[PDB]
Amino acid sequence: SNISRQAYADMFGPTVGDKVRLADTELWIEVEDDLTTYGEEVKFGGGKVIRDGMGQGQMLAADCVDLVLTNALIVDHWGIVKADIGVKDGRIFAIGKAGNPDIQPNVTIPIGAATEVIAAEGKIVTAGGIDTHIHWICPQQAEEALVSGVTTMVGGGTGPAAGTHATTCTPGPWYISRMLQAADSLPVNIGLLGKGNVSQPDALREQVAAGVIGLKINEDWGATPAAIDCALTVADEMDIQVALHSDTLNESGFVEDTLAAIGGRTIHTFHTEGAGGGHAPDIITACAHPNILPSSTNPTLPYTLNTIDEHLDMLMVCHHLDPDIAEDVAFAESRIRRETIAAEDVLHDLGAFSLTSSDSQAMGRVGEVILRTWQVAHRMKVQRGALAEETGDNDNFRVKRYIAKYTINPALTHGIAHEVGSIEVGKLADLVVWSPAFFGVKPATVIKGGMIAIAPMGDINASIPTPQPVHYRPMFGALGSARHHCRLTFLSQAAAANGVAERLNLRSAIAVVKGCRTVQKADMVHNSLQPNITVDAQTYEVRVDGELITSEPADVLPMAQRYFLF
Amino acid sequence: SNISRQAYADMFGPTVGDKVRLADTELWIEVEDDLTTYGEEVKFGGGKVIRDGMGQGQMLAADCVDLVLTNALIVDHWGIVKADIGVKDGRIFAIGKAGNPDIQPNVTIPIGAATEVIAAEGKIVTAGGIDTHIHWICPQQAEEALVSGVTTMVGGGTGPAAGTHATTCTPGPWYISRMLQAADSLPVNIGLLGKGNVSQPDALREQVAAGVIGLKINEDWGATPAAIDCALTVADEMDIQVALHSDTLNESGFVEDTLAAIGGRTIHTFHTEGAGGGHAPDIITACAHPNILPSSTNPTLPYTLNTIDEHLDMLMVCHHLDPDIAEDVAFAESRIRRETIAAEDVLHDLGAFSLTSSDSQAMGRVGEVILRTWQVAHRMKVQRGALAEETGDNDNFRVKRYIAKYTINPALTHGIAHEVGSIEVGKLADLVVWSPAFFGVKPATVIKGGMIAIAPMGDINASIPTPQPVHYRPMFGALGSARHHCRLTFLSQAAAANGVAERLNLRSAIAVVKGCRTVQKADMVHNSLQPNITVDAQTYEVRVDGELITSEPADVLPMAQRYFLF
Amino acid sequence: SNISRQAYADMFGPTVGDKVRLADTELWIEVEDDLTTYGEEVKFGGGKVIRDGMGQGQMLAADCVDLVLTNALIVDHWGIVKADIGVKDGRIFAIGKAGNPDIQPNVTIPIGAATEVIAAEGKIVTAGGIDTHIHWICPQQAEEALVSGVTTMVGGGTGPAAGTHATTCTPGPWYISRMLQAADSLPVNIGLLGKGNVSQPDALREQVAAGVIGLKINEDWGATPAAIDCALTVADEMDIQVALHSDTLNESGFVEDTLAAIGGRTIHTFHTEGAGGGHAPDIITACAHPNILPSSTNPTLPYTLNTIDEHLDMLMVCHHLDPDIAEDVAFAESRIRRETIAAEDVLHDLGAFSLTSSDSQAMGRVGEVILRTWQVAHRMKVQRGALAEETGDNDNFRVKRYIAKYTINPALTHGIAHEVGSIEVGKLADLVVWSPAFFGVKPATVIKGGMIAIAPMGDINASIPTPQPVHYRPMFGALGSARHHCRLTFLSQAAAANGVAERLNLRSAIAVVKGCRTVQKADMVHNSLQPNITVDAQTYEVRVDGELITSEPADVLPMAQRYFLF
Amino acid sequence: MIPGEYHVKPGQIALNTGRATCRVVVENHGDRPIQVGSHYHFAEVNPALKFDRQQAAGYRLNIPAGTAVRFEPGQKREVELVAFAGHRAVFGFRGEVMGPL
Amino acid sequence: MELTPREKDKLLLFTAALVAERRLARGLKLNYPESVALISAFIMEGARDGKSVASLMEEGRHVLTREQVMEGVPEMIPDIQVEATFPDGSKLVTVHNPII
Amino acid sequence: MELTPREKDKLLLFTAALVAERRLARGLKLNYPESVALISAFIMEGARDGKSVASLMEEGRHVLTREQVMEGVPEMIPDIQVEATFPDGSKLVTVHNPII
Ligand code: NI
Ligand code: NI
């Protein structure tokens, strides 16, 4: 029997050699491999394949998966392939060919009575995003982020308090304990950051032992060489990560003094371009070092016509600065530079910057990490053409390089890649299903630990789930005890050992961070470039090997006005 | 002392011989009995009867009820009577005469310091509805159903996944466990159905032992004779119910082959008319058998001008069919027949069909089970006049016959009638209070296990609870621990024995199902007709004893545009 | 160094001698004291004071506060002072000068790594309000009240049932238990009142032993001398409070008979003016007695043009009265008197009435206790000028007298002043932050037990928390386990002893009431006046020492149309 | 067609049939109005009402349950009473009986 | 704006009234919810204008007539109640038999 | 009004349509959400008017044309579905390829 490639594409989704446009961008991905056996694809519905004795076998629950995503087009750092996905016990069981071994060939994902089915034909499936720059200003951010496709949130805060408005810190044992308890109510995996600004190590060890998986050094609490050193020493001891927002004022030294204070130790630099904070005007030179894992916050991504204009007032409110105080406005202005903003996009395209994040409600948009990452990719393709690593007439490599920025790299940077970050066997089943036309903008389904947690849902009283109005509503995976079972609360090894979970009576699954001190720039997937970069002290021009690095601001962007009501 | 019957009706509600119109329908009920002693009625308010030493006595809590519904007009399968209702320990204590035995005669429901009062004078009180065809596509369905007057929901699903969109199955132990845990968060009693489509009995026993109270056989998973037999064998073993959606395609046999496979064993046939699924075009003949408990889903109820037109696309989306695939559209069309749709209404009126249900968001409307049941009653009275069983100039018998369809019969069919289903002593206090003008449409109060769970509520900041806007808002009975105490999670006897509740740490009250295999058509209250029914294979005409069974489509219906904003 | 007082005020808020207008009223408060050391004020932000080694020290968590409110203008019964507030372990640690003792002088509130910061410069901070007349008609009232600045709610009810609509009673053990369990889900401290109307003491002891912290005597349940006596006897035994809504009908006696029945025992009289209930037309004379703690409900506060007009229908619906029954309307009319309504405002100004409360959704507005209290203060200043106790050109004393009405006095009246009621060391940290322009109307932050529970919040996806739309949204302190840790459920000493909390598995912090029988009129802060008051039986004129007490109705009020959308 | 309308059959209802009744003249000697409910033990009403209390022992007003009779200051009127039933035990009110009778 | 829950709740009433207003404009006979919403909104605006409670209790009975609503509707609405911020604070307006 | 959840949910659709209606009036080419909201609301009103399901399935394809919406939009909306209370109860209206 034969079937045309078009009819096939319409029935089971695209296959090897077919290309798909990502949303309304100019980015095209090409199917690199298909793990099916033509003619043996599984499909669910009346008179279809997944039925007793046919595509569904006679195995007991232990011998089959709990859930199968049929005919999914996987987009991950390791490949863009067509395959069935098996999920068992809340984790990714296998990527392969689903069905019944009794009558079908090459079945690697067994379907039985205990198997639920999610039809992914014509859909793109990705791992859930991981945002590592979360300010816990309000609990509503969790739903906003989940809806956008982000399933893990690492950050600090206690609510809408001055300290949290400006920094990602959950100060001390009491607040850390309270927020860990509150975390059980949120539908995303969570890890907290304590206040790392202090020159007494014991004050830090207390916080780590209380539960934080990292320490935030922020200039608002004093990013001095003494504080930085103290924090890094405790981090090396307890296997936790350090995030840095450096001394913009150059009050205690210049960028090189900070770099000297770090002394080659692993550190994650937040908003490395500088607008969001850091030694003016050259904090961006940090991306040249092997021990620095650099990220960007999202308001500057990508460079557009209105970028500069909106930044001044955003800066002032976030950091409690007074526009009437000359020194307050002068230091705000020294942070916003068209030169470093324009270079930042190119540095991402080259892989010198390895992560994207939000900086939620503190010079960043919580629901726009994924969206803005793809807009930068689009603008860079438009301006620079194909990457040198690109093979074939598609943007497969650029796609893999950019998706790694909000999935695997953030997970590696914070020591949680053993649990989440990619669609690999054994990892927690945090998956996002996308229709190609809405890729990166509005997902079709968001799965947390094997259960759908949120998805667009039509009229509750309708005869079908599709009638209007369709809007995002929480599903069973976001409910009470089911939620606790499908989410993870990350703890430091020390907290886990001291029995913090049992003491606070935390109800969710617990995971421990590890490998935070050994990760380096070379480990960032597809983003390990360490450029010979310089910044002109007077003009602020960024140069890599003497070449000027710059770009043009966009007037119009994809994934914008065609999708949003406001 | 004397008082006119009109003033009396205005003060305490109607009494023996008075008639009341149900909403805006043509159905009239007549008070058959009044259990009060004229002059001794209890009324609450300033200067009223329920006061210390007067209508309220001196008994300790153990000697009086927790709640009394004064002057209620009860409408149930057993009668339409005027009486006070006593609720104690979350259960129906007694139906009789409330007050203080110290100074009042014939008091059977003692009122003391520990007694709360709900004024039901002029109101109609019914048992909460029970929907047995729930697709757990989203958690919001629970509130929609509760608002309509349905307090128990039996079904299957895992969220908005392909399998759940089409079938009422919660596949396997892991998903069953997750949904049982999620059930604690919903304000309705819940029982789950597992996937019954498999030819290995052990795969089914595992699901029952995990917690399901029934098994759903659906054609989308393969409704073959082998699967049906396997499921019925396990059902007979574990005392659980089987719900069937038969082979529409006639792929494995015709209706008679399915009937042969069932072999006289008890089974609940979903949407027996066929539009929602089943052997084309004669699955409706199933209602002639003694071992079949037949139900209707709600989109076809009642037959109206727009019924046929809306069904094709509803069918396709629900079952994942392709309108471009000729065989997919041909099989959709073979399910929609004006002939069987028109007969279905008459068969309900005659009591050949015993239950009504929704088929929530999968060819059914979750908030319209009760409403559509009364619309069918109205249309049948309008078209066929009084029933043969009717006595007096009222529609009391037709009312009892139809209310049994969504209360007691569903409870008997699924083995939970020992806990819910009717307003009888010892049963859980799931009651719905209705103003006659909004009967069956929008209830005044919905009580779950003795506590009000939801009700229309005006401005929260107002001086009284009545100012606008008035809309349904969750009450204390729907909150945290109070909710757990007022709801039931039904388990199979096996799960209960294996300690599933303790293992999953289920917080709600637990009830076990029983008597699922012994129930038969003769047991359906007021709906035990087993007609000699036939269907013409070419014309699709339905005949009972050779007589053509048909009806006319409504152009306008009551309980519609006069009550809804959209 | 020097700085002008205006620039100073703009930077750190006002200081000694500066005056601030309360919202849009004519009330002005003057800073009486400032506990800072000029030049050593702590301020948070980039390049500010609270940074490592500077305003933040090296102490371990146990040696510093968890939260500091910098430069707050405290308004409490004891003073109007400028100072930093320290919060530790959910309680008020100290009122003084915050900072780092290592380099700063006079530091009494140490700031370390474990310290979060809330910038209160230019803000007014008050204790959370306490409403003691709550009808638990619906759970939504808790959020409405929290938003208005009320953090503790004492009352009774079971939901929207007839009894609860009219009275503040949670009848009996079963309902009491259910509501205690439901209380864990609400973001406010809660204490319940049982039904005190019975002449058998054991029926009351059962309720107290079950958990109530008081007993409500309401005329709708029979406020007879026998019931009142019985309730007071049990109250004296179990150290719980009694709230009274007397016999409006004069059915069992006149006001003097009720007063005789009370026999000098401590009792809290609800809506002492009478419109909300009580012996017509002289229940207001109760404020002359030393054992009576008198409160006002809020619809009559303050006397305005539309006050009388709106009361008749409000009265009828609340108490289930029939407008067609002459005696029902006559008794409603006897409760509404312009004479007693006009006097009530003056009696508050003089301190003869000691508390304000709502009477939520039962002739009272739950979100308007604070707002209406300040409107009465404004109207009294406008009409009567300065109080005799006033010193200086400000309204500091009138402010202290009125704030005591919804903070400390309600706490003293109900035996919970050891836990809440004022901003004093050791008390639970229930604090409300206000911008002067919105004082008493819409707060900037509401803190429950050390955690922000609710606050106005802008666009969740915005770059900052300020963009529109800004509306009140629940914060972390209102979430799951964090909420349980930050709220209190008050129990009677007996319930606490019998292990009610462990039996019901209550998750929140527990506090016990005490000192309810020893409190008297002399103990009411700034409101201990016992006037020689009389009421003319025919004209209803109120006279104190023969002088006529009256006032004029307002045509327009502050804290009204300039702030609300509807 | 009126949604939920009643069709009350004409006629009257006889209240408290078969119980002893008695009429008494009552006079309000107080300066404030007094209103009495249908089930209140009449012999224990506000002392300002002057009547033969001894005859009213164990009686309440023979009026529809939930209604009341109002006595304005100085008002004199004849009321009909009906005897209590059940155990005929009186508890509460002004605390004058507190037991059977 | 710092909208409190009650203000947000009133926005729901305002919107329900917009629905009714447009249908009345089309010449349709209003149903139960539409009638209640339309009259309620009218009163809220009256309060914003500064009219008295007494004035509105009367004016509210002249918003819709029996000929502008479906059969049975007038009898389903014995009265309408709504509160709004008058110049002198929140007050309750009760309109008896609004539709005649 | 005793608004049920579904009635309140439809108020959200009505409001989304008001947004689109005003932008169309300004002469803007509508985007994805605006188009879906505008056509949906139209159908809901048709049902309130008493039009049949068959009539609306056709009428709904003539609300917006390809020239009144942004590029790609017609292809992003293969069909629109919405339910409303017809004189004969709730019915589903499915409009295939509404924008041509
Ligand atoms: Ni930063
Ligand atoms: Ni930040």
Ligand code: NI
């Ligand atoms: Ni089916």
Ligand code: NI
């Ligand atoms: Ni179904």
Ligand code: NI
């Ligand atoms: Ni009262």
Ligand code: NI
């Ligand atoms: Ni009250």
